[PDB]
Amino acid sequence: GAPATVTEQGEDITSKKDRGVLKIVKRVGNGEETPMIGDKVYVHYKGKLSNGKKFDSSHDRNEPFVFSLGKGQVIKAWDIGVATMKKGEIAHLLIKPEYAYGSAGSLPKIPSNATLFFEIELLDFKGE
Ligand SMILES: COc1cc2cc(c1OC)OC[C@@H](C)OC/C=C/[C@H](O)[C@@H](C)OC(=O)[C@@H]1CCCCN1C(=O)[C@H]2C1CCCCC1
């Protein structure tokens, strides 16, 4: 399924080239701008542990998810991944624990050493 497709076909968007954040563009967005640290960013997302054992979605809350890029509100993989996205883009990310919750995990939702999958739609972004 989608996690294994990102393993096989995803681009490694990490600086270290350690395959810690792998990306597929599923729907192309518009415009030249991409989100930058400090921007206020508006998304919809669907996430899950890569083995399907827990799910989460902005739609569960009936509203976009909003965060400030690079402000420590999201996991490192989102700061890295969403900064590559254009307005309107849908992307898939597959994420190693080093760019998510690590060996400590984040119980009860996130076990130690968890790999994460997200589908993210970038709705909008604004400067601080
Ligand atoms: C570890 O705790 C949670 C993880 C995740 C979602 C959670 C968590 O409980 C606080 O609740 C959903 C609502 C309440 O919060 C949204 C964003 C939270 C924050 O931005 C942090 C905690 O989340 C993240 O950094 C990432 C990226 C943004 C969207 C949420 N995401 C998660 O890791 C999910 C996670 C995804 C895989 C399945 C389990 C939930």
Side-chain angles (χ1 to χ4, degrees), residues 1-31 34-45 47-52 55-61 63-70 72-75 77-125 127:
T5 295
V6 183
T7 298
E8 296 168 14
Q9 314 177 1
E11 175 183 356
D12 182 351
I13 59 168
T14 63
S15 300
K16 280 194 181 93
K17 294 293 189 270
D18 62 14
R19 291 178 51 86
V21 185
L22 297 167
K23 185 184 178 197
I24 302 179
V25 173
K26 295 311 282 201
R27 188 181 72 193
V28 179
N30 299 112
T34 51
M36 293 189 155
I37 293 164
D39 284 358
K40 191 185 186 183
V41 183
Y42 301 72
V43 309
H44 276 301
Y45 72 90
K48 56 172 166 170
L49 306 180
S50 61
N51 65 15
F55 300 81
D56 174 53
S57 173
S58 49
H59 297 294
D60 292 340
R61 296 182 304 250
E63 56 179 31
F65 174 67
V66 182
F67 71 105
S68 294
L69 200 139
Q73 303 171 1
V74 298
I75 54 171
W78 270 46
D79 282 337
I80 295 161
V82 175
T84 72
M85 293 182 71
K86 304 183 147 48
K87 187 167 172 195
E89 179 174 321
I90 300 174
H92 285 180
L93 305 179
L94 189 64
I95 303 159
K96 294 179 185 190
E98 293 77 14
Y99 295 83
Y101 300 91
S103 56
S106 198
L107 286 180
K109 289 194 179 155
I110 316 293
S112 171
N113 291 155
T115 295
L116 308 190
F117 173 86
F118 296 83
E119 183 172 273
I120 302 175
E121 181 177 340
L122 179 56
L123 303 167
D124 203 3
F125 53 103

